[PDB]
């Protein structure tokens with residue numbers, strides 16, 4: 001609805017996670033305020049050009065990592081991106097690994113998730129009177145997944161092509177007994193705190209959303225358990241590789257997602273009562 | 274406490290789920306407002322006669338399916354039914370199946386549940402200073418379960434005589450990875466969104482509550498995953514069968530539940546500290 | 547910050563659970579009000595002497611068991627203990643058993659937990675702008691665990707030396723289908739309602755916290771399922787044994803926890819961003 005400055009539009013949105021507070025990537029950056037019915041997004045959205053494509057960057061934790069996962073205004077964030085006209089959303093996230101072969105420094109492009117959050121307050125945009133139940137069997141946008149995998153391959157980085165993300169509430173990390181459940185019982189591959197309800201809202205807004213995850217740690221399974229400082233250090237050390245992948249992929253997103261490879265692109269057709 | 278019109282009482286309550294917004298079933302219908310300490314119930318309660326038994330009908334989603342599962346005022350709904358004097362509560366619900374032999378169009382009368390909700394805000398009526406911990410090992414009222422099973426048999430419908438209901442938060446449906454957990458790990462039979470905390474509150478109010486579930490879909494396991502429109506279509510197509518079962522069962526509920534086959538009928542005796 | 551009376555300090559904190567509303571244990575008891583940014587703790591804190599060590603006792607449910615698990619102001623409780631200067635926290639709790647050999651009347655000193663709560667509203671003290679993710683792989687303080695185990699042995703009581711606690715939301719007890727999940731799928735040992743988020747907050751405050759649990763029931767697995775009255779009766783019958791253990795252990799806590807056996811004692815060093 002209202003933006004300041006007025007008239008700003010973008011085509012691709014990038015949501016930065018741990019370690020990614022600035023868009024080193026955009027040219028001609030303008031900071032934009034976007035009105036939402038839910039109040040403030042995490043920070044200003046930075047809009048600029050990447051090889052002729054207009055990109056909107058939002059740090060989910062705000063600049064300086066000021067907002068922990070449970071306190072993020074997920075509704076405002078996704079509303080603001082949708083209001084700017086974006087069709088594609090790339091999320092860049094730090095995750096823990098629950099398997100030896102998904103190693104620190106590897107990328108993962110997950111294809112499934114399990115929601116073990118509890119305190120996020122709103123899991124939908126739709127509280128009535130139109131009841132909306134989106135289908136999320138295949139919750140990520142395949143068109144964008146495949147493009148991230150291809151970019152990673154071309155640049156020579158390791159990119160695991162599948163993975164189930166278990167989303168936990170936090171902010172504490174898991175106990176050993178919990179980690180054993182995630183790994184041995186649920187057979188999840190990676191773990192983080194921020195995917196839900198971000199992905200649910202992206203789907204409801206009919207966006208093509210995918211996650212580019214970077215493994216930062218092995219959860220409770222190494223000699224030393226994960227610490228926050230380790231996650232941050234690992235991300236900051238590798239942010240250059242994530243930036244290179246974004247510069248590779250974004251120019252290829254000049255067009256529209258293919259409907260047959262975008263499960264949420266027409267989610268509301270069959271979902272609203 | 275206060276009702277408008279004044280003096281209205283009922284013996285059986287029916288909570289209608291998806292597809293069941295009107296009580297085609299009652300005669301001499303009066304719309305009733307019932308005061309509750311929790312504000313508005315989902316809609317007016319309709320009170321009328323079914324073969325000499327006074328029945329109170331409440332659509333949990335409101336008329337026109339205006340209230341999604343996470344936004345229902347469960348406390349107000351159950352308080353209002355209790356205030357009218359009801360002893361028996363039949364819930365009619367749409368569920369998904371996690372097993373091939375529980376097929377779309379079949380009825381299920383579940384005997385257990387697993388609560389995987391997270392955002393329902395109140396799971397009890399008792400916040401102190403009297404602490405109440407009801408026993409819910411066998412959470413449904415057996416007297417009423419057995420009567421529903423018998424009615425279904427007599428009318429010639431398929432009624433599965435047991436089943437564990439996994440209650441999920443929604444409003445989105447499950448991912449494939451989540452559905453695999455419900456089915457393969459938890460070994461649940463059916464899935465829905467509305468049972469909790471409705472059943473907890475019914476037990477605390479010492480009501481005899483049972484669910485008549487209708488299978489509308491196979492969750493994420495068919496060629497096509499579940500959509501909201503499919504659930505609604507399937508329910509509306511079969512609502513006649515549900516109405517026939519209610520007309521059969523309600524006249525047999527002229528009496529009181531048998532205490533030895535009503536786990537919650539004296540729940541508060543041993544539960545309050 | 548502000549206390550009334552002013553100037554009160556304590557070294558050991560004891561949080562009493564079900565059945566333990568008074569500190570039969572302390573001498574020279576003074577009731578203390580401690581300001582917190584979160585409002586009222588469960589009750590006054592009672593401060594007094596046990597063989598030369600200053601002890602602060604707080605009943606988590608308040609006197610008279612007025613506050614059920616979901617309504618406890620966990621932040622206020624832990625803030626108030628920290629403000630008084632305590633370094634050690636002993637929690638005394640009633641738990642259910644999920645295994646035949648952990649019998650009613652036995653003590654358990656758990657070493658792990660699984661959090662299955664959903665409605666506790668705040669799981670941390672840190673909502674930003676400093677983001678804090680504490681490591682809780684080994685969530686209890688080992689120094690204090692070992693001292694409780696030793697005391698139990700010396701007095702001749704059965705004390706199980708390990709156990710995974712599954713924390714459920716309540717206030718209703720588990721269904722049979724849920725209990726089967728806790729026992730057979732998650733392989734938990736004991737069950738209760740109060741550990742989370744108490745333990746998370748204790749860790750964030752850099753306290754040495756451990757639980758002395760008493761088994762009061764076998765959950766849904768005996769001839770009769772658990773009832774609230776049974777739990778209370780069993781605790782009140784055995785509170786003398788718990789008091790004897792506290793009198794044995796507290797004089798040995800005159801010193802400081804050993805850092806190498808206190809996982810949370812420097813939790814914030816690596817946890818804050």
Ligand SMILES: CSC[C@H]1O[C@@H](n2cnc3c(N)ncnc32)[C@H](O)[C@@H]1O
Pocket residue numbers: 018069094095096097168173174191192193194216217218219220226227228229231232679819
């Ligand atoms: C900066 S440390 C906190 C961040 O770590 C991410 N994360 C990385 N490793 C893990 C892990 N092992 N478990 C949970 N979240 C993790 C979470 O999404 C969170 O926002």
Ligand SMILES: CSC[C@H]1O[C@@H](n2cnc3c(N)ncnc32)[C@H](O)[C@@H]1O
Pocket residue numbers: 133273291342367368369370441446447464465466467489490491492493499500501502504505
């Ligand atoms: C009208 S579509 C939404 C309703 O479908 C019911 N339901 C039917 N099938 C499923 C399913 N597969 N998973 C979850 N809830 C379902 C839920 O209880 C909800 O209120």
Ligand SMILES: CSC[C@H]1O[C@@H](n2cnc3c(N)ncnc32)[C@H](O)[C@@H]1O
Pocket residue numbers: 406546564615640641642643714719720737738739740762763764765766772773774775777778
């Ligand atoms: C006084 S009855 C309620 C208390 O029982 C404790 N508890 C004892 N047995 C169990 C059990 N089987 N399941 C859950 N909590 C239990 C809980 O922590 C709660 O505060």
